[PDB]
Structures are given as structure tokens and as C-alpha cells.
Amino acid sequence: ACGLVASNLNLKPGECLRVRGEVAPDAKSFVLNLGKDSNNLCLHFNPRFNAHGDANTIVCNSKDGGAWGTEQREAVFPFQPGSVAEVCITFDQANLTVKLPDGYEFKFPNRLNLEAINYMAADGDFKIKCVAFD
Amino acid sequence: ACGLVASNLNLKPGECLRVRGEVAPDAKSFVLNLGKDSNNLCLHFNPRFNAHGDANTIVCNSKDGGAWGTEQREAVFPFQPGSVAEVCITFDQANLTVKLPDGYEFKFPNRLNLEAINYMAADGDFKIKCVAFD
Numbered sequence: 310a311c312g313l314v315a316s317n318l319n320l321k322p323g324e325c326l327r328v329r330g331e332v333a334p335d336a337k338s339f340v341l342n343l344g345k346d347s348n349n350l351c352l353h354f355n356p357r358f359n360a361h362g363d364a365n366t367i368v369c370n371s372k373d374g375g376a377w378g379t380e381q382r383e384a385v386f387p388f389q390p391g392s393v394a395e396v397c398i399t400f401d402q403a404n405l406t407v408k409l410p411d412g413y414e415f416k417f418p419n420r421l422n423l424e425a426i427n428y429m430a431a432d433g434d435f436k437i438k439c440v441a442f443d
Numbered sequence: 444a445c446g447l448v449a450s451n452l453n454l455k456p457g458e459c460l461r462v463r464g465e466v467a468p469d470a471k472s473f474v475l476n477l478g479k480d481s482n483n484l485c486l487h488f489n490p491r492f493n494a495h496g497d498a499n500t501i502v503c504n505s506k507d508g509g510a511w512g513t514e515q516r517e518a519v520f521p522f523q524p525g526s527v528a529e530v531c532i533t534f535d536q537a538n539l540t541v542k543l544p545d546g547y548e549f550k551f552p553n554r555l556n557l558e559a560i561n562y563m564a565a566d567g568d569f570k571i572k573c574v575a576f577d
């Protein structure tokens with residue numbers, strides 16, 4: 310609830326969500342939130358450069374009716390402060406797939422078994438320049 | 444709006460909003476609303492193919508504290524149903540400038556006292572493919 314908020318996205322399984330934005334030069338962390346609304350998130354995507362005692366680690370979680378699920382920590386960190394990052398997200402019944410820069414990718418389980426993604430929110434040290442659906 | 448709603452846009456003067464979407468093959472009309480929130484719009488951009496008596500007409504208005512302003516009609520209609528169209532909006536303290544396909548450009552007076560545009564809603568027979576800031 311500080312960066313761009315979009316609702317009625319109507320993202321369907323198999324469709325690709327493309328997001329391009331600027332990572333702040335003094336970036337500590339940023340957040341991409343996806344799901345039904347702010348209380349129901351299939352993906353809380355949180356690259357931490359230096360925040361909460363995490364350094365250069367992507368933290369992923371879900372939110373079910375207002376309650377945070379269990380955190381998953383990724384093995385890769387293809388982000389750098391002061392640079393233009395692009396993120397592509399697609400999903401199906403079992404998994405979200407996140408494609409990062411430099412050919413990196415990961416899966417995160419679809420814990421809420423959502424069939425549409427209608428909500429997206431950005432927060433922290435990341436400024437969206439572009440959102441595309443294909 | 445059944446279509447895309449965006450808030451915290453933070454579109455400052457001189458910055459440019461680019462929207463690309465598909466006009467349905469049987470489009471009657473579609474809507475881009477820009478402003479502070481649903482009640483306070485510096486621009487209600489409403490191309491009418493066939494709606495409210497009008498045929499192939501662009502209808503522009505504002506909304507201030509819930510009340511519609513004086514309506515304005517443009518003379519050009521560079522939209523065709525069943526095709527992809529891009530529209531670009533930029534603003535200053537005096538005017539919004541709307542750039543249409545096929546080169547046409549018109550001004551609409553900015554009737555509110557807005558530092559920044561924080562709210563965008565799409566509606567009707569227009570499906571957003573891409574949204575960009577500059």
C-alpha cells in the first residue's frame with residue numbers, strides 16, 4: 310500500500326504477466342504481491358538486498374485470509390540496485406512460475422489454488438515502468 | 444469498473460501514460476478514467492461507437508466531488524472495433540493532452556487542483572494489453 314496497486318487484473322492460467330521496473334540505487338528490499346486481494350496472496354515476492362537480517366535472498370510466502378503462510382527461500386539472486394529488472398509470472402493449478410533476469414527461474418506452490426489472479430501491488434525500492442499481459 | 448483499476452500511479456506533470464488494448468469486435472463504447480479516485484476525475488475519456496444515442500464520437504468530461512462537469516465532444520474518431528489501439532496521456536496544471544492513433548492530438552482542461560494523477564480505471568469494450576509510464 311505505497312507503490313502501484315492494480316485490481317481486476319483477470320490473469321488466467323497460462324497467461325504471462327510481465328513487469329518492468331527500476332530498482333532504487335539504495336535498495337534494501339522490494340515487494341511484488343499477487344493474488345485475489347490484499348488479504349489473499351498466492352505470491353508475496355520479496356527480494357531482500359539487506360533487510361530483516363537477510364542479505365541478497367529472495368523470500369517467498371503466501372497470505373490466506375490475512376494470515377502469512379510458511380516462508381520459502383530461493384537459491385538465486387539475479388538483482389542489483391540501481392538497475393532495470395523484468396519479472397515474468399505465469400501460473401496453473403499447482404504452481405506459480407517466476408522467470409527472472411539472466412534466465413533464472415523458480416516455482417512456488419499455488420497454496421490458495423486460485424484460478425485467476427486479480428490483484429497486484431508493488432512496495433519498497435522498486436518503481437514500475439511497465440505492465441504487460443500476453 | 445469490470446476492467447483494470449490502478450491506484451498510486453503517482454503520475455506527475457510532464458510524465459506520459461501509455462495504454463494499449465484491444466477494442467472488442469462488437470464494441471459499443473469504452474472508458475478511461477483518470478484522477479484521484481472514483482469520485483474525482485480530471486479526465487473521463489469515453490469513445491462511443493454506439494451508445495447514449497451517439498455514433499462514432501469521443502465524449503470527454505470531468506467529475507468533481509461526485510458531480511459531472513460540462514461535457515465536451517471531439518470531432519475525430521480514429522478507432523475501429525476489432526483492433527488494437529494505443530492512447531497516450533500527459534498532463535500539466537492547465538491541461539491534459541490526449542494523443543490518439545493516426546496522429547490526432549487534443550487538449551482537455553484540467554478542472555481539478557491535482558498535483559499528481561493517482562487513479563486510473565478502464566471499463567467497457569476495451570481489454571488492456573500494456574500500461575507504461577514514459
Ligand SMILES: OC[C@H]1O[C@@H](S[C@@H]2O[C@H](CO)[C@H](O)[C@H](O)[C@H]2O)[C@H](O)[C@@H](O)[C@H]1O
Pocket residue numbers: 353355361368369370377380
Ligand atoms: O514472510 C513474509 C513476511 O516476512 C516478514 S519478516 C519475517 O518475520 C517473521 C516473524 O514474524 C520471521 O522472523 C521471518 O524469518 C521474517 O522473514 C516481513 O515483515 C513481511 O513484510 C513479509 O515479507
Ligand SMILES: OC[C@H]1O[C@@H](S[C@@H]2O[C@H](CO)[C@H](O)[C@H](O)[C@H]2O)[C@H](O)[C@@H](O)[C@H]1O
Pocket residue numbers: 487489495502503504511514
Ligand atoms: O458526461 C459524461 C457522462 O455521460 C453520461 S450520458 C450523458 O448524459 C447527460 C445528462 O443526462 C447528457 O444527456 C449527455 O449528452 C450524455 O452524454 C454517461 O452515462 C456517463 O457514464 C458519462 O459518460
